[PDB]
Every structure is written in C-alpha cells, then in structure tokens.
Amino acid sequence: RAHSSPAFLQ
Amino acid sequence: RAHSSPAFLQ
Amino acid sequence: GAMGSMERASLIQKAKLAEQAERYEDMAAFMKGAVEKGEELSCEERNLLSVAYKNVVGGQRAAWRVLSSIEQKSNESEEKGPEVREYREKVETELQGVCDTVLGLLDSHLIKEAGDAESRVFYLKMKGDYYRYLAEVATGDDKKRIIDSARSAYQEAMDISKKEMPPTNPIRLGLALNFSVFHYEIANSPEEAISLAKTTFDEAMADLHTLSEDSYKDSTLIMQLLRDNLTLWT
Amino acid sequence: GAMGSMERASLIQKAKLAEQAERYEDMAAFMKGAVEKGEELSCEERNLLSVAYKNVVGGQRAAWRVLSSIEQKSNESEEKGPEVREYREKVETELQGVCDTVLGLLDSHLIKEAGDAESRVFYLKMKGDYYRYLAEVATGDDKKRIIDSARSAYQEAMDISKKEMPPTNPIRLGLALNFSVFHYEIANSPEEAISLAKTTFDEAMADLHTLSEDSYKDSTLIMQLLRDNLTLWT
Ligand SMILES: [Mg+2]
Ligand SMILES: [Mg+2]
Ligand SMILES: [Mg+2]
Ligand SMILES: [Mg+2]
Ligand SMILES: [Mg+2]
Ligand SMILES: [Mg+2]
Ligand SMILES: [Mg+2]
Ligand SMILES: [Mg+2]
C-alpha cells in the first residue's frame, strides 16, 4: 500500500 | 501503573 | 436486544472476526448477544467475552486518565469554563455504563450457573475487576461501597481458587495478580499487595515442575507480571 | 443534531480534548457540530475536522481490509455460512456512512463558501479523498461513477493549487500525493501516478530555497512521502 497525505496540512 | 492480568487466561 | 434474531453460533463466529479486525466494540456486542441466549459459556467463549470488554473499557480508562490529568492541572491557572469537566464526565459515564453492562451479565445469570472452579473463579475475578474499574473513577459517598464490592468478589474467587486449582493455574495467577493491584492502587494497602504477589509467585515456582512445556509457558508469563509489579513496588 | 445546544467554541475546545484522549469518534461528532453552526472554518478548525474523520475512516478501512481478505480466502474451501460476508457488509455500510457524512458537510456548505485557495483546495482534496475511500469498497454499477467523482474533485483542486499556491505548499503537496495514489490504486493508471509524483517532487525541490527552516521541514516531510511511493512503484 502506498502512503497518502497526513490529515494535518499546514 | 502496575500490570494487571491479560484478558485471555488458559 | 439487537442480537436477538442472530444464531448463538453466528454471534460467536462474528466475535472472532471482530477480534481479528480489532473491532472490540462490535466484539463485545456480539458476545453480549451470545450471553443473552441463556446458555453457559465454554472456556473459549468466556475468554472472548473478557477480551472484548477488557479492550473496550481499556480505551475508556486511558481516555479518562488523560482528561482527569488535564482537569487536575486546570484546578491548580486560567479559567477555561466547564468544558474539561463536562467531557471528563461524558467519558466517565460511558465507562460506568460498560462496567454496569458487564456486571449485569455476570449477575444475570453467568455467576449463578457457574459450578466448575474454572468458570466460577473466572467470573468472580471479572466481577472484582469491573468493580475495580468503577472504583478508579469513584469520588462520592459510594466509593467505599464500590471498593467493598470489588474486595468481596475477589475474596470469594480467591477462596475457591486456593481450594480447587493448582498454584500455577493461569486463572488463579491472574486473579491473585489483579487482587494485588486492587490492594496497591485502590485499597491503600501496599504491604498486602506486596505480600500477596510474593506468596503467589513463590507457590507457583514450587509447582512448575509438574507442568508440560506449554503449560509452563502459560504460567510463567503471568508470574513475570507479578515479578514486574514487585520490582515497581519495592 | 445532538450538538445543537453546545456553543461553537465549546465544540472546538472539546474536539481538541478528544484528540488528546485519542477519542476520534467523539472528535468527529464535535467537529460535525461545529460545521453545522454555519460559520466558515479557520485553518486550525479545518485540520481538526480532517484529523477526526481521517482517524475514524482509517479504523474502518483497516477493518474492512481484514474482513475482505478473510472473505476472499473463503471463496477459494470449506463452507462456513453467510457470517463473513454479513459482517464485512456491516463494516462496509458503516464506512460508507462516514464517507457520506463528510461529503454531506462539504456539500452543505463548506465548499460553496470557501473562496481562498487554502480552504477551497483543502476541501476539494477532502472530497476526492472520501470518494476514493468509497471507491475502495465499490463493486457494483456505481464504481465507475464514484471513481469519476473522485477524479473530478481532485482535478478541480489541482487546477486551483497550480494557479494559486507555490509548489512547496503542504496542501498542494498532499493533494498531489493523494491524486497520485488515486491514479495508482483506483484508476489503474500507474504511469500517471508515477509521472505526477515525480513532477510534484521535482517542482517542490526547486522551490525549497525560498523557505524558512520551519516551512522547509513542513514541505520536505510530504516530499518524503512522494519519494517513498516512487520507491515502492519503481
Ligand atoms: Mg438457535
Ligand atoms: Mg493568567
Ligand atoms: Mg460522574
Ligand atoms: Mg453450570
Ligand atoms: Mg453561540
Ligand atoms: Mg474439507
Ligand atoms: Mg455493500
Ligand atoms: Mg468565504
């Protein structure tokens, strides 16, 4: 499985 | 904190 | 109950699937439904019931401790309103509800039908455990009575376990471990906790020679927890 | 809604407490209540909303994958009845319900009121993400339409982000990362996924010189995820 974005984005 | 028993006991 | 239309065997099968998926709230709901079918539980089924509720209440206890610590810091300095207390109370009430659910299953009617030592001690230990979790959050005029209820359940379980089980039995060991934690953390009796842990460990040590390789592993795993607590307490 | 009587500021305060206690279902319910007050969300509040629902749906996706794998093995050899399919369907329906809830908040009325690039891109990315989670479990005559809905939301977000944000912006980077995952895992377009990840990484690299130490850390953290995927895919 690939990595997706963290929920917190600055 | 102390350790208590696991839930599974043989 | 929402599980009244599901077969007992299907509830057990789904509890095992829920365990594999780490869906412990579902697992507990399936096992509650299985208990409410009214038949006694096998060894495997009793352990499914305990695993499910221990994980549910474990998340609630961890959350309660986080919120209680925040609340304690708030009362040392800037006023922030009622929200911390309100939310701690919300989590506390849900924790108490789960404990009451488990205690209700034990009272209707798991304990009264449990005649063999392995089942009866297991359920009385659970009764002590869930009163102990209630005692962890109790602060009012009922703290003393909750503590007495835990003590009484643990004591009945201890009396049976000493008469009917070998000192290496994992249920007997886990009961003694938890009663010792009760003494240390709930009952303000650290010397009793230490004495019980030491005597339990030593009596089990002297009986290990009777065990198979697999039973030896089962017993020594719990004995190590007693040793870990003794290291923390002494 | 059960949160209609609670102050907006109290809902936000309790969402932060729920995060500290790892009570993500509570956190999501508090943030849903905050959204339903009807005011736009600040940067901090948008991130609370995303953290809450991403953790809720993350547990459901992990459980669904466990159950789907068990179900697939069952159809290779002994018949065990309908229970695995039933329970997989139960988890799937709850997952779809959470995705529909998030999509409903975005549609009523977060996206239509979001005019600044940072808010609008963040919400359109979320719309693509939750359609992507729906696509992960879709199998019927609606899989193609769900995939198209995810693609369309991601594409609108990409168009805005390229026109309005620098190539190092963490929202722009996280959007490109997730659209690349969409291409690889959902849309059967691994070459598009690889091209997008590479171009995104290289354009960000060339803009790092403009950033402070703290912004450099923010951007490079996401860039490393693009690199990790490229290593997995090539
Ligand atoms: Mg039947
Ligand atoms: Mg001050
Ligand atoms: Mg209370
Ligand atoms: Mg009986
Ligand atoms: Mg107001
Ligand atoms: Mg066969
Ligand atoms: Mg379905
Ligand atoms: Mg606006």
Plain-language structure description:
- With 10 residues, chain A is low in regular secondary structure.
- Chain A has no helices and no strands.
- Chain C has helices at residues 8-20, 24-35, 43-74, 83-113, 117-137, 143-164, 170-186, 190-205, 213-233.
- Chain C is globular and about 60 Å long.
- The C-D interface holds C 10, 13-14, 17-18, 20-23, 26, 59, 62-63, 66-67, 70, 80-81, 83-84, 86-87, 90-91 and D 10, 13-14, 17-18, 20-23, 26, 59, 62-63, 66-67, 70, 80-81, 83-84, 86-87, 90-91.
- The complex binds magnesium ion (8 copies).
- One magnesium ion (MG) binds at residues 89, 92 of chain D.
Helix and strand arrangement:
The complex is a heterotetramer, with two copies of chain A (10 residues) and two copies of chain C (234 residues).
Chain A: no helix or strand
Chain C: H1 8-20, H2 24-35, H3 43-74, H4 83-113, H5 117-137, H6 143-164, H7 170-186, H8 190-205, H9 213-233
Helix pairs in contact in C: 1-2, 2-3, 3-4, 3-5, 4-5, 5-6, 5-7, 6-7, 7-8, 7-9, 8-9
Bound molecules: magnesium ion (8 copies).
The site of one magnesium ion has 4 residues of chain C, from loops.
